[PDB]
Design a protein around this ligand. Structure first.
Ligand SMILES: CC(=O)N[C@H]1/C(=N/OC(=O)Nc2ccccc2)O[C@H](CO)[C@@H](O)[C@@H]1O
Length: 334
């Protein structure tokens, strides 16, 4: 089987008959996990194993950013700092900050792969303007050059465990704050010269992208996730990006602008998304699976988000010097 364009979630800590039906649908391509799917490491591994048993080509992801966004914080998972902490460390010691960023990346990816997960929806590349509360301390730094090199060092640590990455929220969620959709009335050039710069500078170190549920009125009235201008003209065209594009959670009502989930899913894919996220309502996601009108190009990019190579099980990772080394550095540096 080949991955479909829909990423959804399962009902709980153990796979159900309804999950198996949904996982087997041709338009299913991924699973995203949340805190309700984690009891302990043993349970989570059995869950991810059973998911791949139903659909061997499935992509399994999770929002593991650190700080305020980390689904798995217990039973050995290292509580990671808010990315804003790394920008603050950068301001005291640039090179040390890049060293810690990689260690955070490797810890993050290694622990996730030990439980059978492919990727995390990280890093946040939004600039820390201080404007967006939903972003807040999830942003690395105000300076796009600092965001680039810190995020790059983190993506390097992810790659050391064979894990990819996903920058967000394109073209930038940091400026709009802004219950309807946020709006950003800056000019295209202003958005390109700063918020978009990390996506451009990261080059091949950027594996994927999530667009923002934000309307940039001076560029396109459609939200970035449903904007062919942003996803094709800018990202694919002007920047030459060839990585995967995941929509932001379509379950966010205001993002759909009066349309159904299925209609919003068709618009996102039509705009340029390779995969769409429908979180926290599997039955509504199943309606999308069966009503979707919309692959060759996308399937290639989706397959390339699978974790590369073999992963260390927990019994092996806990005794690995590199893992132990990263743990110590994180404690001392922060
Ligand atoms: C802007 C933001 O924080 N978007 C996140 C995000 N946000 O989802 C929602 O805000 N969902 C929502 C909000 C209100 C009602 C229903 C769903 O979903 C993705 C997958 O979980 C994350 O990777 C994104 O980073």
């Amino acid at each position: 089987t080949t991955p479909g364009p829909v990423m959804l979630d399962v009902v709980g800590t153990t796979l159900s008959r309804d999950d198996a039906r949904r996982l087997a649908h041709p338009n299913t391509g991924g699973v995203i996990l949340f805190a309700r799917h984690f009891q302990n490491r043993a349970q989570l591994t059995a869950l991810t194993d059973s998911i791949r048993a139903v659909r061997e080509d499935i992509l399994i992801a999770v929002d593991h950013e650190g700080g305020r966004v980390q689904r798995f914080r217990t039973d050995g998972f290292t509580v990671l700092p808010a990315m804003r902490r790394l920008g603050e460390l950068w301001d005291r010691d640039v090179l040390l900050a890049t060293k810690v960023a990689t260690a955070v990346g490797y810890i993050l990816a290694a622990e996730l792969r030990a439980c059978g997960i492919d990727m995390s929806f990280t890093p946040v590349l939004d600039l820390d303007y201080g404007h967006s509360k939903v972003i807040g301390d999830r942003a690395f730094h105000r300076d796009p050059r600092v965001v680039t090199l810190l995020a790059k060092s983190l993506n390097h640590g992810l790659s050391l465990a064979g894990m990819a990455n996903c920058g967000k929220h394109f073209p930038g969620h940091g400026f709009a704050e802004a219950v309807a959709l946020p709006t950003d009335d800056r000019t295209l050039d202003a958005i390109l010269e700063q918020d978009v710069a990390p996506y451009d500078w990261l080059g091949l170190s950027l594996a994927a992208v999530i667009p923002a549920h934000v309307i940039y009125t001076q560029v396109d009235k459609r939200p970035a996730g449903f904007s062919r201008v942003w996803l094709q003209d800018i990202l694919r065209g002007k920047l030459g990006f060839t990585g995967a594009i995941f929509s932001d959670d379509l379950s966010m009502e205001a993002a759909r602008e009066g349309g159904t989930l299925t209609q919003a899913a068709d618009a996102a894919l039509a705009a340029g998304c390779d995969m769409v996220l429908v979180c926290n309502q599997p039955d509504a996601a199943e309606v999308v699976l069966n009503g979707l009108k919309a692959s060759a190009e996308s399937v290639r990019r989706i397959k390339r988000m699978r974790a590369r190579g073999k992963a260390l099980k927990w019994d092996k990772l806990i005794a690995q010097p590199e893992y132990l080394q990263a743990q110590a550095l994180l404690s001392s540096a922060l």
